[PDB]
Amino acid sequence: AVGACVLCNSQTSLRCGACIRRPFLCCKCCYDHVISTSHKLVLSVNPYVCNAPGCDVTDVTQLYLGGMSYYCKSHKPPISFPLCANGQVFGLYKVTDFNAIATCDWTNAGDYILANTCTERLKLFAAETLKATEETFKLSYGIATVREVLSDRELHLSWEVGKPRPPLNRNYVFTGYQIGEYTFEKDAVVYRGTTTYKLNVGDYFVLTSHTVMPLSAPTLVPQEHYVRITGLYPTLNISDEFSSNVANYQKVGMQKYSTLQGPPGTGKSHFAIGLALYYPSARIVYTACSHAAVDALCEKALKYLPIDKCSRIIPARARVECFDKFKVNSTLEQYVFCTVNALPETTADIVVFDEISMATNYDLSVVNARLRAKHYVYIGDPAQLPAPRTLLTKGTLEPEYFNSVCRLMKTIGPDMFLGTCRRCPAEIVDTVSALVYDNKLKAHKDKSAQCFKMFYKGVITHDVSSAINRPQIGVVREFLTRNPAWRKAVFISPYNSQNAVASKILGLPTQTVDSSQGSEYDYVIFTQTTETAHSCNVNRFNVAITRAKVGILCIMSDRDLYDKLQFTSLEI
Ligand SMILES: [Zn+2]
Ligand SMILES: [Zn+2]
Ligand SMILES: [Zn+2]
Prior knowledge:
Elements: E1 3-4, E2 11-12, E3 15-16, H1 27-34, E4 42-43, E5 64-66, E6 69-71, E7 81-82, E8 84-85, E9 88-89, H2 96-103, H3 109-117, H4 120-138, E10 144-149, E11 154-159, E12 174-176, E13 181-185, E14 189-193, E15 204-206, H5 246-253, E16 257-261, H6 268-278, E17 284-288, H7 291-304, E18 310-312, E19 327-328, E20 335-339, E21 346-353, H8 361-370, E22 371-380, H9 404-411, E23 416-417, E24 420-421, H10 426-436, E25 442-443, E26 451-455, E27 461-463, E28 466-468, H11 470-481, E29 490-493, H12 496-506, E30 510-512, H13 513-516, E31 521-527, H14 533-536, H15 538-545, E32 548-556, H16 559-564, E33 568-569
Parallel strand pairs: 16-22, 16-23, 17-20, 17-21, 18-19, 18-20, 21-22, 24-25, 26-32, 26-33, 29-30, 29-31, 31-32
Antiparallel strand pairs: 1-2, 3-4, 5-6, 5-7, 8-9, 10-11, 10-15, 11-14, 12-13, 12-15, 13-14, 27-28
Bound molecules: zinc ion (ZN) (3 copies).
Binding site for Zn(2+) 11: 5, 8, 26, 29
LRR repeats: 208-228
Subcellular location: Host endoplasmic reticulum-Golgi intermediate compartment
């Protein structure tokens, strides 16, 4: 019952029994908590409660020390000291922001803003509290039981009354009863088991709520600048292919952590792998939140780094298929490729943390906890998509509050900017450069003259809250009859349910904007589906249209975003 004060570090025996995470608070801080919030339970070796038989007074503000023991006003002996006096709470060794973090329900943007503008120890408290609150909310959704099994990929579900039903997308992973993890898509529902299984009737599905470990390591270790490349040995022969990156590579070596903002198709992957070739003896751990981002770093590594010195870490509770072509789970290889959640406790010359817009402050802490390293490299794009905040329903989370790295990239700027898009037709590069990159992103490719926009609001139907626009798909179908090059196009929308309808009617492969992030395709068809905050978010829009290598068709609901597309407008 003895720890350091999460606000100021001062030793104490006071934790807040009201806070879900029960943080150690110093007497000066514990007071300013209890006297400002509904949080009145203080703990030490024993609870600060009235010790008189049958008395229920736990409010420290109505409590006194009578000898060794605590009493309320009604029970205290004549010789007693109140537990709250002169801005302190009686403890051994004798905050506005802490209070808002400790009591918020995390449904408001301002809660995430504060969890990212605050002091560094408060970012860990916030990150821990948020994640705790996120997991306890999963317990609020109704259990799903299998009524009947139609096919090997479709069944009929019965939903517990008196509890709400979860969104049936790829985000929401269920546990079958442990008969493998399962997702569902929309009275016929499409089921997808991790382990293939004759899905027994009576079997039930639940959202597994994993207990939240406390955090220790800061989001960002403290910054160190060096006069010379520290702890790394650069090649004197580096292939022309990576010549562009040498100054950035020397910056990586001359400070503790560095930030790389790389817009779509600007060479983030190339940069990350180019780092190993420039520091050829350096042990490098390649990490991201998702298997897809880590796999993408693997595909690049396979092309440039010796396969014998690469390992893909894969936890024995596997959830998707991972990259196969490396030795699996060899923690000691020079090159290690591993999701944040699966990181081993180890050291490294360089940690490369990729897709940083998708990381939470929880993830940034875990990494600094599990990996002791000479250099930390943070790669991604704050103009791209953050991790979903399942609890956030009010306000929009701006890129400067995604996590500590994005806040740095949005405030003091990134240490390094990849400024030339080599993926996208210039029509797309020019659109996004103006929209989210302050005109700093340059087109390598010419205009493709295969980038089209149509303003067509259509009709918005909903499967629950998930939007569908059949007329927008109708327009796409018409377009395809006259544009046969697009037969191979990937269909993209901000909505799973629009994607389900586009699958049936068009037969095109289908992606949400959020699932499309990090991928590229020759041709993209985008239906905005709706005018909502979701569908008009400039980051989501940016990702949507930068997936395309050759052509994009955008059926738009929003005038502002429509007019900004530097595309040939179509009629109908
Ligand atoms: Zn509290
Ligand atoms: Zn304190
Ligand atoms: Zn009492």
